[PDB]
Design a protein around this nucleic acid. Structure first.
Lengths: 76, 98, 108, 92, 83, 99, 83, 108, 92, 76
DNA sequence: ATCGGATGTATATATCTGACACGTGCCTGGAGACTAGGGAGTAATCCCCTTGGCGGTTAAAACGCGGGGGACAGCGCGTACGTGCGTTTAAGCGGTGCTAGAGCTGTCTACGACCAATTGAGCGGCCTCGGCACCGGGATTCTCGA
DNA sequence: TCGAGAATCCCGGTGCCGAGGCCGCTCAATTGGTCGTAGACAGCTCTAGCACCGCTTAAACGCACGTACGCGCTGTCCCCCGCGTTTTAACCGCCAAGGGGATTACTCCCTAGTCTCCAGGCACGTGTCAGATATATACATCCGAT
């Protein structure tokens, strides 16, 4: 079960998840392979803002998903 | 025999009640409608942030309270107990508005 | 190098001397600013804040409350004579007025 | 990140009344008061600098602006506090 | 989209309960029209300032930081909105 | 056979006369002595340029004239003609000076 | 040298002339003390501001500009002296 | 270079655009000043001074005088209602007051 | 080397009233008025420019300051004169 | 009849005058030998300020006079 | 004054929900150290200009007195406003939705700052003539006892 | 109603000094280049202001009655005004004198500028108790009746 996380920068990684995994779980996985803090990411799937407490199934994330990621800045 | 407070007794109670509280006194929707229709003659489209309307209401109520204090002072000076429109005009003259 | 000690700490103040200095520079008040001016201004602001807060806290205690309210701030400012002079043209949101009734209006 | 005097006002309040709390509306009012006083004193000092054609604002200008602005007793106490702070800063 | 009267919405009991805050005990019957002429000259002196603040900002929204800075301009300073 | 004006005609004539002229109604030397006495409680030695003294006198004259205008308005509002000390206090109290 | 009791230099005819210019046709006998008191307090305020100006200027002379600034900071701007 | 032409001349004004620009630069108002700001301000000042001088000269002519006096200036300013709002807090030295008696004071 | 507005006031007078005189006190009062209005408009324009996070004072800020400080038809006429002057200046 | 004009700069010239000559006449003479404008000079003799309309005798200018000269600036 | 029903105000108790106070993590703004250089402190110098004193004039202030008008207390009336009630009306609250635009970012072009030379506007000094202040006779105009 | 009488407009004449005109020189406003960056403009996103609906009920409103208060009048007396007479010190002019304001030059030191480092102030989350609300009960006030 692999879904694709497409960032605003045009760099798309290949991420393998589980059907029972959560939105929060994906955030920590990218830190393991890129060192990016989980809280600096804004996941946008199906046009609705994902929430940390929700799983990857509540939004019906089928495989080969184009997951659009927004990156935020701590300070303006 | 029905109960009836003498005139001027409920007025003092209302004075004491409303001089102790801080609640906004004018109805918010009518006030906002009045503000919006007044601004209709300066800019054709306005959006009037809720905090801005709240500030307008607070300022207007404070101004009216001060003006009525001065009107009461004029009324008491004129050896009266009630206020009259000429008391407001005098107060607004000494203050230098009109 | 030596340990960093803040300007407020070495002046004995609690207000930000550095922030006051930055605001003075970025305020278009003057081309240059002295070293002691931000310290002096921060001290004055701290004293005024303490002066207001003491009366506000006493007024809040008078109403059996452990938190400050705009009503308490209004009461303190309007009850102190010289604060009334500083803020006689200042209206406070949700502050109300002092309880006043002219003696003529009282019943005989 | 926005900037305000909330933390400094809270420290002053803890120093004065250790057992007393304070609300968000009171934070807003205190920030407004501090900004107003800062603006008044800074404008007076700026005017004083220009009148004497001085290009720098110093403790002398701030002190005479405080004398101009604050009323009788508060002006004296604030000048005393500021002078104490200035001597403590210069000596230490 | 068009509002016409909107001035009787400041009702007689609303002019009272404010005159009460001011501290009056007895009110005439012609005080209400005078008090509605006021607060219509007032706040019209405040708009047309708050606008041409929002107009200078090129916004079309009247923020609270326009009602403030229109006050403190009209000689009245409002706290807690707020600068 | 003494000619006698009724009480009030000479007052109105003086009003019409003194509203036409722009001179100063307070004696210069007494006013300067008053100013120097008032300033003795701030600095021991002050020099008080004549232009400064004249500016102070002009400001005081204008302020007193405006205060008397408001006092007269209060007196007429009280259904009176004479001005009284309580008229001055009410004018200042509304104006924002009597605390 | 030492000056005192110069507040009586504002004589009764001077106050009557000022009231006449203001538009007062009848004056009571207690007006003069109140007028002297209010004149004294106004003069004290203005002269205090002027003295603090001329003391910040490190001078011993109160110029006309000090009086002008003292009046201007109280809202009573005075034209005709260089301000 | 070509013969110097004043900014006031090329803007069709009498007030000094260059001197207004210098005063704006040397007033610590902002660190940068737009090119058209001094022109606009000079035009506004010239319009205001012309507006007051017109009424002052009219008053002087009404008073059978061929010079404008502080009294004429005060009469013009306090007779024009739009100028009176501008200069309601301004007192003119040697300006006097307008002749005005309340109707109740007249003989009857 | 003192500099004032006397010459410009005299020119404006000769333009409006072809033959009328100015006493020295009247000229001084005119200069005081000009300085007062200049300071008022410039201060309001500076406050405006700072409120919008801008480092420049432009004709837009001057026009809005004129609108803010000038009551009634005076504001309209002053704005008209200012815009006409600015466009004539830009035309050449 | 020669009198000495001592300037503030310490440079003293030798000037030959006539008993009937005026204060103004001396001013023009220095322009002939130095080019200095007459109006930029402030002549101080015997501690009193000389006036243009007065002669050199009204102040009793004896020969070998130490004439102290002050130079002014057009603009401050 | 005195009592007591009736009304409203204030007080003690229980619960209870959300706003305030304390932690944690981080990141930009505050602090440390050295320089260049102009702003201001400081010592002289001159002379405008403010202070003190004096003598004569007289305009203005001070005092006194008669009385007419105005402040002011008194009393009646009738009318306008406060008080209470039943009815109407829309304010207040909740929940949803949408799209207009407030706010933040990336490029880059025009625009204002900055510096060198120059000259023409305006400020300083003189100077002179006419507007203007004062004098006085003049006719007109407002007041007041009839 | 109408003269007596004081105030005021008015119409010449005469002398004075301030506004306006003229001359010069000098300094800052202008012209003309460069150059760094302020914001103009396009793109995009996510808040929130507006618009709608229904439901509950507090607030407004029209009505009716009574009472106290504003007003209008009237009578007292007292006090401020107008006029005359005596006193004084304001005022104008003149003179002596020093002091400190303004200006210039010398210099030194204090602040803006720049880089580098780090820690304290902000965002965030969380938990917990303080004021809010409801409920029952004792107490102070009002006014009608005696």
């Amino acid at each position: 079960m692999q879904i694709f996380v497409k960032t605003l920068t045009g760099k798309t990684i290949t991420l393998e998840v589980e059907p029972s995994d959560t939105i929060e779980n994906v955030k920590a996985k990218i830190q393991d392979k890129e060192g990016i803090p989980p809280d600096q990411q804004r996941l946008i799937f199906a046009g609705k803002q994902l929430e940390d407490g929700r799983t990857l199934s509540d939004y019906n994330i089928q495989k080969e998903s184009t997951l659009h990621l927004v990156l935020r800045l701590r300070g303006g | 025999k029905p109960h009836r407070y003498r005139p001027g007794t409920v007025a003092l109670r209302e004075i004491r009640r409303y001089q102790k509280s801080t609640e906004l006194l004018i109805r918010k929707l009518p006030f906002q409608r009045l503000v919006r229709e007044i601004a209709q003659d300066f800019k054709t489209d306005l959006r009037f942030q809720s905090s801005a309307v709240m500030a307008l209401q607070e300022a207007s109520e404070a101004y009216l309270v001060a003006l009525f204090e001065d009107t009461n002072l004029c009324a008491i000076h004129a050896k009266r107990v009630t206020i009259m429109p000429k008391d407001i005009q005098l107060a607004r003259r000494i203050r230098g508005e009109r | 190098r030596a340990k960093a000690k803040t300007r407020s700490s070495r002046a004995g103040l609690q207000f930000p001397v550095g922030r006051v200095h930055r605001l003075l520079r970025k305020g278009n008040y003057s081309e240059r600013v002295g070293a002691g001016a931000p310290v002096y201004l921060a001290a004055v602001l701290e004293y005024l804040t303490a002066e207001i807060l003491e009366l506000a806290g006493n007024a809040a205690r008078d109403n059996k409350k452990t938190r400050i309210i705009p009503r308490h701030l209004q009461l303190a400012i309007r009850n102190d004579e010289e604060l009334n002079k500083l803020l006689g043209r200042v209206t406070i949101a949700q502050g109300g007025v002092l309880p006043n009734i002219q003696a003529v209006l009282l019943p005989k | 990140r926005k900037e305000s005097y909330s933390v400094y006002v809270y420290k002053v309040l803890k120093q004065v009344h250790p057992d007393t709390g304070i609300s968000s509306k009171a934070m807003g009012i205190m920030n407004s008061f501090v900004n107003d006083i800062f603006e008044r004193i800074a404008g007076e000092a700026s005017r004083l600098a220009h009148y004497n054609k001085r290009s720098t604002i110093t403790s002398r200008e701030i002190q005479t602006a405080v004398r101009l602005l604050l009323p009788g007793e508060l002006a004296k106490h604030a000048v005393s506090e500021g002078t104490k702070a200035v001597t403590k800063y210069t000596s230490a | 989209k068009v509002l016409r009267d909107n001035i009787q919405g400041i009702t007689k009991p609303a002019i009272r309960r404010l005159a009460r805050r001011g501290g009056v005990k007895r009110i005439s019957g012609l005080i209400y029209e005078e008090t509605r002429g006021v607060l219509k000259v007032f706040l019209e002196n405040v708009i047309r300032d708050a606008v041409t603040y929002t107009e200078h900002a090129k916004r079309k929204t009247v923020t609270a930081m326009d009602v403030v800075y229109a006050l403190k301009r009209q000689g009245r300073t409002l706290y807690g909105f707020g600068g």
